[PDB]
C-alpha cells in the first residue's frame, strides 16, 4: 500500500478480506479390514484488501 | 583390438584413492569384465611398473531420476593395485 | 447397530450449526512502560 500505491500508512484499515478454497491434495489413509479411505489436505487462497481511513 | 588401454578406464579420484598413493597402492576404474590376472599386465604395459597384488571390487551404479524418468547410472569395477616396492606412478602423483 | 445419518444435512442447517463457531478477539490492555499491547496479568513481551 505505502510502497507501491503511495497510500500513507497511518490511515490504513482492512477494507475487505477473505479466503477462497484452493486445489486439495488427496492422500490415502489405510484402514481396518483392507479398506483405505482418502483424506484431503486442503488449500486456502488468503486475500487481504486495504483502503484508506477518511479521518 | 583389446589393448591394455581398454582394460584401464580412468584413475579413481577420492580421498580414499589418494590415501593409498603413499603406500604402493594405485586404484583405477577398470572395464567390468577384466580379470585380476590381465589387469596386472595392462597396468604393467601402460605404466611400465611391476605389479605384485591386485584387489578388485564391483561398484554397482546408483539409481537416479530426472522426474518420471527413472533409470540407473552404469555399473563399474575398480582395482587397487600394488606396485613393486619403491616403484611409483608419476602419472598419478598429481594430487 | 452402526447408526448413520438419514439425510444429507442442508447448507442451511450446517451453517446455522455454526452460528456459535465464531471466534472472539484476544483480551488486550496497554503496557505499563512500553507503548505496546499485552494480555492482562501477563509479563509484557517488551520491558518485562
Amino acid at each position: 500500500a505505502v510502497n507501491n500505491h503511495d497510500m500513507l500508512e497511518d490511515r490504513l484499515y482492512v477494507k475487505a478480506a477473505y479466503v477462497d478454497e484452493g486445489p486439495a491434495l488427496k492422500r490415502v489413509l489405510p484402514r481396518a479390514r483392507g479398506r483405505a479411505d482418502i483424506i484431503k489436505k486442503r488449500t486456502s487462497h488468503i486475500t487481504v484488501i486495504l483502503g484508506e481511513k477518511h479521518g | 583390438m583389446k589393448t591394455a588401454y581398454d582394460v584401464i578406464l580412468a584413475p579413481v579420484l577420492s580421498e580414499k584413492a589418494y590415501a593409498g598413493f603413499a603406500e604402493g597402492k594405485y586404484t583405477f576404474w577398470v572395464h567390468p569384465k577384466a580379470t585380476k590376472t590381465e589387469i596386472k599386465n595392462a597396468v604393467e604395459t601402460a605404466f611400465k611398473v611391476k605389479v605384485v597384488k591386485v584387489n578388485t571390487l564391483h561398484v554397482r551404479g546408483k539409481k537416479k531420476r530426472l522426474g518420471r524418468y527413472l533409470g540407473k547410472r552404469p555399473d563399474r569395477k575398480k582395482a587397487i593395485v600394488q606396485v613393486a616396492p619403491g616403484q611409483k606412478i608419476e602419472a598419478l602423483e598429481g594430487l | 447397530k452402526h447408526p448413520v445419518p438419514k439425510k444429507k444435512t442442508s447448507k442451511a442447517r450446517r451453517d446455522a450449526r455454526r452460528s456459535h463457531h465464531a471466534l472472539t478477539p484476544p483480551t488486550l490492555v496497554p503496557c505499563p512502560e512500553c507503548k505496546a499491547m499485552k494480555p492482562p496479568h501477563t509479563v509484557c513481551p517488551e520491558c518485562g
Partner: protein, 118 residues
C-alpha cells in the same frame, strides 16, 4: 465429584507425578528461575516452600528429610548454606509465579515463570 478434595493429578499416575515434582524442584533449586506450564507451576509453589523451610531448620534431620526428594548432597548444600539464609526472616512465600504472555505452538499451552523470591 471432587468437593474439597484438593491437589492435582496431571495426567500422570502416583509414581510419575511424584518424580515430576522432585525433578522440577531439583531444577528450580539449581537455576533459581524456571519456565513450565501455568498449572505445573502453581503446583510447584508449595512443594519447594516446604523443601526450603526445612533447609531453614538446618538440623541433620531436616537435611536427611530433604534428601528423600532431591536425592543429591551438592544440591542440598546449595540449599542449606546458600539459599535458605536469604529467607530466614521471611514468613512463607519463598516463590512467585508469573505467567508468560505467549503460548507454545503445536501445543497451544500457556506458560509461566517460576522463580525464587526477592
Amino acid at each position: 465429584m471432587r468437593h474439597l478434595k484438593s491437589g492435582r493429578k496431571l495426567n500422570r499416575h502416583s509414581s510419575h507425578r511424584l518424580a515430576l515434582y522432585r525433578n522440577q524442584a531439583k531444577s528450580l533449586l539449581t537455576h533459581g528461575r524456571i519456565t513450565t506450564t501455568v498449572p505445573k507451576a502453581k503446583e510447584l509453589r508449595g512443594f519447594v516452600d516446604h523443601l526450603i523451610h526445612l533447609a531453614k531448620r538446618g538440623d541433620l534431620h531436616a537435611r536427611r528429610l530433604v534428601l528423600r526428594d532431591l536425592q543429591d548432597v551438592k544440591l542440598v548444600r546449595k540449599l542449606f548454606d546458600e539459599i535458605a539464609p536469604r529467607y530466614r526472616d521471611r514468613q512463607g512465600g519463598y516463590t512467585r509465579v508469573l505467567k508468560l504472555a505467549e503460548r507454545r505452538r503445536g501445543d497451544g499451552a500457556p506458560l509461566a515463570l517460576v522463580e525464587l523470591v526477592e
